[model samples]
Target: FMVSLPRMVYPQPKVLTPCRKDVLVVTPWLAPIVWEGTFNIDILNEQFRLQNTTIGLTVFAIKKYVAFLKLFLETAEKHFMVGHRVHYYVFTDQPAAVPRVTLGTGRQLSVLEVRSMRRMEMISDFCERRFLSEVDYLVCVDVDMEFRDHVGVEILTPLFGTLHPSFYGSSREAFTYERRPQSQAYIPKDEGDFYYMGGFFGGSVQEVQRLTRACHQAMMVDQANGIEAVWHDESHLNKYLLRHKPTKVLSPEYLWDQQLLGWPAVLRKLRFTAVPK
Candidate 1:
């Protein structure tokens, strides 16, 4: 059986938004104004140590691994690039568990209560209303992500520096999907390389607001159309980028999947300090 489909995409209303760079503040007295160039373990450790949480976080709460979450912050804090203000927004049905995340960064962490749905609107709304509108950059990260080192997002900022938008994740070349009628936009064919657009992403707050909303909208369309593909934000993010690519591209190393990467050094130290089970 064969299904004929149009080789086209529905044109969405396009809107232009500018990036916000005015909000990011760092003392000019500090040398090496660049995020990566100004790596200072001493002050960073102080900042990180003070951090009690990170912003824009969500958890379905059923199968989320705290170890992974811990490892994520432990590593992120260590490699945090200077000049970036990190905040934590943990969205979970069990907001009480949010207190368990003990990453020190002297950053503000807020818990937002929202019903869980397949639509990406929850996260999009979170970023748009909370993070994107204020910060110089907005990093969209998954609760399941783990990093290799304390790599600063500043290093990847350049990839998005000149662009209209950008995301941090690996690039995908060969991939295939189902074409069954039960699946929305299901194509029983393979497509060439396109960026995976997952794991991590950052840029001017306004630009990220635009990209995130677009991706969130794309996800809703897929749900409304009849396809129930993977939802935790990746598929929609990819489709969003497929339609509106960022001005820059981040390297794959910024984020490592659980299957491929280990926890950052910070986590390893925590493991060492752990009491005997």
Candidate 2:
């Protein structure tokens, strides 16, 4: 009698060619800085879809920001975590204000009430409550932004952050990290890496839980000690990413300001951008 073993199959090795040699392609931790030529969405889609990946997008739409939802959700329908299960969690002060943006078959939106101060802890609580069981990963972004192009499976990583479009080209000393020595979000002039934007970030359910929990904890400590960071939550986020390091970093293409910084030749695509107020 003989036993048969499964035939060996290996994963495709990554291409070594630089998408943009002038730009930082990968982090010191070996995480890819997602840019146009850096990934093949077809390949990523196949991999994530095979696992039945579900993405929960979290956004805060308080007051006037709610106005952006109509376009946001509408455009998201056109280009956002498409072809995969998506649950949009709109954390807003007025649930009734949420627009009834019709979604695709596999997508849904739920308006979560935010009566009091949820802010940073809100994301953390959502994850612990049911986000872990409801979705595989969560992508958080500011309410004022719109998806100008495809934002899909290629960005899915256990832990990831977008490089601040404003500071991507600046030197470490030029980075706007909190420099005060007493605060939890402080980064000395001599020590730092890429500056991460707080407007957008995300990870796997567990990783998101961990990131939010840690940031909330640090925030509480700063509050107790009468220390407020310069950029508030964003400052804390940059510090966190500096220490833990995101598994993937998105390029400026994923985050840009067309009004302020006009599209440059280096940017192949302006994916997600700010909508003029």
Candidate 1 per-residue lDDT, tens place, 1-277, comes to 2233324343333346322232211323221222222234444434433542233333333234433545555655555543345665555555555535555544555666555233246655754665644444556555565444554533333113211112222223323223344543233334312435454555556666676666566556666875655533554455555455454443333443333344433122111111111
lDDT of 2 by residue, 126-205 (tens): 54778977999999898788888999988889999998889888999999888988999999998888888888899998
Q: Give the clash count for model 2.
A: 0
RMSD of each: 15.7, 4.1
Residue 57 displacement in candidate 2 (angstroms): 0.2
Model 2 residue 129 CA deviation (Å) reads 2.4
* Highest-scoring model, TM-score: 2
What's the CA error at residue 17 for candidate 1, in Å?
Answer: 38
